[PDB]
Each structure stands twice: as C-alpha cells, then as structure tokens.
C-alpha cells in the first residue's frame, strides 16, 4: 500500500532500541503518503534510513531529535500538510541533533556525532506551522536557506527559530549554486526557488517565465500547466487529477432533493478520493471514511460483511463504553469503581488500559488493587474497538485467561499511534485468548515479559490485515528454554498454532470437539456417553436412548431419534417412565396413562371424571 499511518510519540523515549528501529522500518517500508505524523528520534549511528527515500507527502508533521547519524535522506519529500503541529507551533522540527557536548572526546579522524548537513532537494512546500532548528553542533548551511519560499502563502505562521552555532568550518557553497543558498556542497544541492521568481500572483511556477505559472490547485512545482500535471494536489487527488472536492455520491433533483445513487460517487480518505473505504474505516452517509460513528448513528453489519454507520429510528442501543471513548475520556485505568459499568458488556467501545496501579492501588483515591476475582465483568465481551493496554496482572492468574470470548480487536485507537497491544511489566506465562481471530490495524507489542512463552507459535499472519502490520519481540522469555521445557502446542493443534499450554487452546484441530476441548474422536457406539457428530462436534445422545453399541443409538438431540427406547415409548418419544396423561391443555393429571407390554405408553381405557379413589392395578383410576 502507498498509504501508511505515522507514529505519535513526540519526545517519549523508545520502548527498546532494537525494537524502535524495526518499528520505523515496518511503518515506512515503501510508503509514499504518510497519514498522521512522522517522527525520528534517538537514531543510533550508522542508521540505515534507506526506507525513507520514496516518501513524498507528509500529512502531519516532521520531527527529528537526538540523532547521531550524519545524514538523513529525505530527497523525494515534497509537501508537509501540517494537519497537527508539534507544540502547536511547528511542522518541521529538527533539534538536539548532535553530541551532548559532555566529554565525548573524538579520536583522530572521527566524525563527531551530529547531523553534518541537511539534504532536502525537493521539499518546497509547508502548508501550516513553522520551522524549529537549534542545538546542532555539526550542522552546516542551515542559515543559507530562503524559508519564505518553502512556506505557503496561506501559512501566516511563518515563524522560524533557527540557530547557527557550529564547531566545524563549513565549506562554502559550490560555485555552481545560484544565490549562494545551498543545501549542501554537491552541485545538485542548490535550492530551487518556486515562490520568489514566479509571475505576478503565481503561487508556484517552473521558472522565471510568465508561461511557467502553475495551475491554481497544485502544491509545489509543475511539469505542465494542467491540473493533471501537478507534482502534488493541493486539496484532493481524484484518479490522477487535482480537484477541490470528491464527487458527491448522491444526486438530488432541484425540486425535491430526492436521493438517487450516483455511480461515480467517491468517499474522502485523507487528501484522496477512494471509490470504497479501506478495510478498517467506517463509511458514513455524509460520504467520508471515519473511525467513530456520529451521534444517533450506530455500527451495523452489512450484507457484504462490512461495517457501516446507520441511522437509529428508536434510541440507539446501550453501547457499553470502555475508556477514553466518550465520558471516561481522560480516565487512565479501570479501578473497582468503573469496572461495575462493565457488567453484561458483550461489545465494548474504546480501549482498556491497565496501569500497575490497578493491581497496586492508590492511597489517595482509596482504591485497593483490583481483585483477581474481580474480573468476571469481562466474560461475555466479544468485540473491542481500540487498543488493549496491559501492564499489571495478578500472580494467581498464570496468564490472560480472562478474555475467552473476545473475538475482534480493531486498531481504531492505537496506544502511541502505532501499537494496538502491549505486554510489558507482566509475569504471565501464556495468553489463552482462544477466540481472538482478528486484529484490525497496528503493530502488536509484547514487551518485557520474563516468564512468557507462546510468541513464536501464535498464528500471526492469519490475524493481520495489511502488509504494514508487524509484531515485535523484545525482552521476551527465551524461546530456547521455552522449547526445552516444552511450552508449545500439542498434536491436535493444527499447524503448530496455539496460544498457551494444554489442548484447550487451538485455533483449529483436525478432529471434533465437545465444547472447549479438541477431542480424539466422538462417542457414537463406543464411549461412556453416546454422541452423534455434527459440524465436527460430539453432541450427547438423549438419556432415554438405550445405548446400543453396534447400532446407531441416536440420530440427533431430541428423544424421537433414539434407535430403541431403553424404558418406554410414549410415541413419538422415549421416556423412562410412561407419564400420567392429562385431559386438558390447562394442567390437570388424572393419571390415565400406563405403559403397555412393549413400552407403548398407552392411555388408560378407564375413565373417572369424578377422580375415583379406586386405582386399577395398572395405575388407572378404577371406577367406583
């Protein structure tokens, strides 16, 4: 896919270096349009950074901090849309990219830690925010840059905070450069001006000729003067055309505005017009893919299986909110207070964060650590939207066995804009999530678990959706001792897929099941009870079916399907005792029914309307 989603962490430290690097690689491998932000921090020396060569547009902001690599290749980047800004003031931040200036005495011929020189030969557009560059003890040429060309005319916030201190005598701009404002020493690094050398009123142009004026809806530079020739569409890119709005998906007559479907209708995703919304987003009637349905609109399962927001006539159902969704918005975790709202919550909206305080208490709030026998709230849960944070579990529980019916987790809300799961600070040994069969979006982290196996065996690929998803191993209990001790699946578990020890958890198994365990075989003729097979399930025969091995005892659930009743026949049913018959529909038992010689639960020939005390030897009420 050419569209990815960027992280959201600002200045927070990495969870792990050897995990952070792979996270960056998986998020930006082949991506061309970066929805969300773009963050590069604490990059070690000799960083690859090759995956960044093909990024062309950033929809959030660009952040670079605390780096020791001497060059970050971002040539093909063209436009930064500044939807959400860093510190609400900046869209391109580059700071602290050098040595801490403490000791770190370089050896002879050693390049000091710090970005040597910015190299961005195509970045010629910023639609909002400013520039923040400071504390770079090895940066060169940052001052000889005409930043008002890069900024957009609508971007009145042309505020730049630029620093010039350096510890190295920078080489002068090469003579081939014009205006002496060069990104670097090489001849091709001279800045290209597209806003100070254009015609009268031309926002962008190819060069200093009045016929070089761009179309009114391009972004930065143009190959031609037609809206299909923009280097980047300013507002919307419909099928290789730069337009102001995606075409409407409903046609209205000018007299009644009655809705008629329009085949050329397009939904809006970012700055693009898509015929059908992506997998995880929700299509609303107003024509935009989103994540949370508007008010009085509820998720409905579609015929083609998709999910879409539909209007409620009656009040919409009592959706059981989680955390951070509607009114438990800033609530961090689940105490013993909010947990009571989670009774009978088959579907939950929003996250479920679990800080250690939940199982370590808070004296100020008078909240004890939540009981390991307080988790019965989460038993009938079947769907969660958003992430599921975990940083505390009871020792009495050897795993996360609580969620036995959670089927779907969708990454509509990711922890840092990247993570849909997390398993850090835990002491658990496995998961036991036997029903989780879909993981909508976002990387799943399982971090700092010293007692945890069953991460090299879980079926990953069958849960993910996009190629951008990945799972990251860090500080996990070693797989070598996991295998040596034997914390893997068992034979019935198909393809070696499982979640924890014991034959209970298998995503699939060859043979049948009796409710929660993959079985070796059903019990049709041989077995303590008698079971018939149905969808590879061993449903137990009715008790009244006389167990007759060598013959099919029962042909289904009800009593009628017994081969031959053990005790008596009340046709068409098998009974242990031929029950006393009844005259009316409204309950009344005059007996009036006795078993026959072969068990045919015959009615009593005698009739006693007065309820004769005398009783026949067969049990019938004998007439007085």
């Amino acid at each position, epitope marked *: 896919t050419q569209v990815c989603t960027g992280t959201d962490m600002k200045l927070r430290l990495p969870a792990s270096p050897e995990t952070h690097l792979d996270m960056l690689r998986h998020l930006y491998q082949g991506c061309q349009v970066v929805q969300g932000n773009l963050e590069l921090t604490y990059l070690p020396t000799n960083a690859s950074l090759s995956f960044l060569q093909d990024i062309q547009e950033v929809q959030g902001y660009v952040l670079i901090a605390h780096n020791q690599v001497r060059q970050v290749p971002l040539q093909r980047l063209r436009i930064v849309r500044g939807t959400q800004l860093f510190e609400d003031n900046y869209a391109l931040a580059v700071l602290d990219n050098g040595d801490p200036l403490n000791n770190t005495t370089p050896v002879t011929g050693a390049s000091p830690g710090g970005l040597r020189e910015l190299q961005l030969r195509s970045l010629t557009e910023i639609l909002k925010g400013g520039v923040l560059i400071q504390r770079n003890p090895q940066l060169c040429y940052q001052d000889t840059i005409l930043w008002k060309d890069i900024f957009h005319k609508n971007n009145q916030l042309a505020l730049t905070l630029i620093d010039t201190n350096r510890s190295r005598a920078c080489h002068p701009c090469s003579p081939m450069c014009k205006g002496s404002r060069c990104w670097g020493e090489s001849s091709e690094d001279c800045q290209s001006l597209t806003r100070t050398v254009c015609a009268g009123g031309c926002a962008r142009c190819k060069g200093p000729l009045p016929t070089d004026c761009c179309h009114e809806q391009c972004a930065a530079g143009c190959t031609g003067p037609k809206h299909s020739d923009c280097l980047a569409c300013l507002h919307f890119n419909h099928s290789g055309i730069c337009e102001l709005h995606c075409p409407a998906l409903v046609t209205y007559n000018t007299d009644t505005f009655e809705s008629m479907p329009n085949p050329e209708g397009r939904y809006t995703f970012g700055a693009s017009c898509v015929t059908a919304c992506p997998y995880n987003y929700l299509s609303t009637d107003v024509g935009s893919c989103t994540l949370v349905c508007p008010l009085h609109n509820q998720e409905v399962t579609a015929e083609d299986g998709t999910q879409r927001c539909e209007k409620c006539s009656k009040p919409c159902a009592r959706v059981c909110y989680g955390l951070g969704m509607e009114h438990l918005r800033e609530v961090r975790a689940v105490t013993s207070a909010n947990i009571q709202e989670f009774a009978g919550c088959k579907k939950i909206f929003g996250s479920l964060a679990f800080l250690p305080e939940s199982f370590d208490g808070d004296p100020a709030s008078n909240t004890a650590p939540l009981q390991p026998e307080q988790l019965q709230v989460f038993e009938t849960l079947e769907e969660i939207t958003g992430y599921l944070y975990i940083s505390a579990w009871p020792d009495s529980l050897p795993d996360l066995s609580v969620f036995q019916n959670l089927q779907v987790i969708r990454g509509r809300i990711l922890h840092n804009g990247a993570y849909s799961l997390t398993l850090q600070g835990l002491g658990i040994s496995w998961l036991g999530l036997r029903s989780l069969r879909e993981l909508g979006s976002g990387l799943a982290l399982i971090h700092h678990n010293t007692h945890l196996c069953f991460v090299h065996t879980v079926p990953w690929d069958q849960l993910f959706r996009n190629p951008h998803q990945a799972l990251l191993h860090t500080a996990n209990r070693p797989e070598d001792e996991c295998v040596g001790e034997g914390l893997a699946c068992h034979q019935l578990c198909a393809r070696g897929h499982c979640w924890g020890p014991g034959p209970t958890q298998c995503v699939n198994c060859s043979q049948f099941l009796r409710g929660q365990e993959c079985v070796e075989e059903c019990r049709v003729l041989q077995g303590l009870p008698r079971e018939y097979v149905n969808a590879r399930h061993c449903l137990p025969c009715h008790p009244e079916c006389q167990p007759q091995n060598g013959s099919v005892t029962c042909f289904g*659930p*009800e009593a*009628d399907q017994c081969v031959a009743c053990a005790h008596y026949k009340d*046709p*068409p049913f098998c009974v242990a005792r031929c029950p006393s*018959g*009844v005259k009316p*529909d409204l309950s009344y038992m005059p007996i009036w029914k006795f078993p026959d010689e072969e068990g045919a*639960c*015959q009615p009593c020939p005698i009739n006693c309307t007065h309820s004769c005390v005398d009783l026949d030897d067969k049990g019938c009420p004998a007439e007085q």
Partner: antibody, heavy 120, light 108 residues
Framework: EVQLVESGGGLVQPGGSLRLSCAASGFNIKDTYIHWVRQAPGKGLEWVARIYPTNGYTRYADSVKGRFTISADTSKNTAYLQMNSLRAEDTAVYYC?????????????WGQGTLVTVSS | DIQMTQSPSSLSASVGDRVTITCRASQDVNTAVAWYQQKPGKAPKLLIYSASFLYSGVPSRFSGSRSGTDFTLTISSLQPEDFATYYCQQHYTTPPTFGQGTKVEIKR
C-alpha cells in the same frame, strides 16, 4: 381462549423469499410443540417442519430440507417460518399447528392457514 | 417413513347409513392414529384420537375401531355436516404422515 394467528400470506415470485409468523394467544408456547404443515391445493395435507420453542429444536421434512428455516421466541411467545428459494410447487395454504403439551399429541389446535402463490 | 393407504375416496351415502372408512399403515403403527375432519376452505380439527377415544364436543355417532394395521372410522348415522375430507394421520415416527383423504359426499 386458544387462538393461533398466522400472518405473511401473499403473492411471491419464483426465487423469492417469504416469512410466516404464528403468534399464540391464550396459551404459553413454553411447554408445547409447533408444526408447520402445508396444504397443497387439490392434494392431501403435508407435514413440513417441527420446532420445540423451549430449547428451539428443529426437524424438517426431507423435501423442503435445506431451503426452509424455522425459529421461535418464547419472550415474544411466537414462531416464525422463513422460506427461501421458493419453487412453483410450493403454492399452498400454510398451517400452523400445536400439540397437547404432554400425553396428547394430536394436532388439537390448528391455525387458520394463509395462501402463498408463486407464479411470476 | 410410514405410508397410510386409505379406503376409496368415493363414499356417497344417505343420512343414517353406517359409513366406514378404511386406513392401512405400511408398517405396524400401534394405536397412534388420529382421524381429522376438514371441510374445504377451513382448517382441520382433531375428531378422534388414539384410534379409540372420542374428543370433546364430538357427537357420539362417530367411532373408531382398530384391528391389526386396519383402522376403521365408522359413522353410525350420517349427517349433512359430516361432509369433508378425512385423514387418518399417524405419529408413530418423527415425520407424521397423512392420507389421501376420503371425500365423503352425500347420496341425495
């Protein structure tokens, strides 16, 4: 009194789908059976399907098996027969039927029957 | 499955005549045979159950007799209202089975 109300009869096209509803008034469906039975015009009656609503057990006739489907709701106290992939032959007067609860399995209380015509 | 073969469907008789309707099961059926009457354009109603016991509200003229697999629905005195299609349904197995109906007209 014991009354059964059948609704849903009317014209349908071949390959279509229809739904019949049998609502029980005057007695509780929680302790009896439910049998949907066809009446083919000019022919004898024919048994279609049985459902027990207390636990919702279903058994179908061989001919209509796979196409038809049955269900019920005790709280609403009624039964539903959803027919799919109708053919021309299923033109019939459909009947809802009960049983005597226990020790009594004659169809004591029938429905009123509703017409279903499939002729395109 | 069990088949019910009925007596010929032409039993034109006058009032008061003893009229017999014969029903034969393909296999043994015990006494789980119920006679239902249904006038055209209406619903069937149980009229005799378990092959021997008259049901509430049914006049005593109607009677049922069993012998082997042969079930005889007998009317001692015919009545004008006793014109319908009659079915000797059985329930001895899972799918109940009906007959072809004995269209009892009236010899007038």
């Amino acid at each position: 009194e014991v009354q059964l109300v059948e609704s849903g009869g009317g014209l349908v096209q071949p390959g279509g789908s229809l739904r019949l509803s049998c609502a029980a008034s005057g007695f509780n469906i929680k302790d009896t059976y439910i049998h949907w039975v066809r009446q083919a015009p000019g022919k004898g009656l024919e048994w279609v399907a049985r459902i027990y609503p207390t636990n919702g057990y279903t058994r179908y006739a061989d001919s209509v098996k796979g196409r038809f489907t049955i269900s019920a709701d005790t709280s609403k106290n009624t039964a539903y027969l959803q027919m799919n992939s109708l053919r021309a032959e299923d033109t019939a007067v459909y009947y809802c039927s009960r049983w005597g609860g226990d020790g009594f399995y004659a169809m004591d209380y029938w429905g009123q029957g509703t017409l279903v015509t499939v002729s395109s | 499955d069990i088949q019910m073969t009925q007596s010929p469907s032409s039993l034109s008789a006058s009032v008061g005549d003893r009229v017999t309707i014969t029903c034969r099961a393909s296999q043994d059926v015990n006494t789980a045979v119920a006679w239902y009457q249904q006038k055209p354009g209406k619903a069937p109603k149980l009229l005799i159950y378990s092959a021997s016991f008259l049901y509430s509200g049914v006049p005593s003229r109607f009677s049922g007799s069993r012998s082997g697999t042969d079930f005889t629905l007998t009317i001692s005195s015919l009545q004008p209202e006793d014109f319908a299609t009659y079915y000797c349904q059985q329930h001895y197995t899972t799918p109940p089975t009906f007959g072809q109906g004995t269209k009892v007209e009236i010899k007038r």
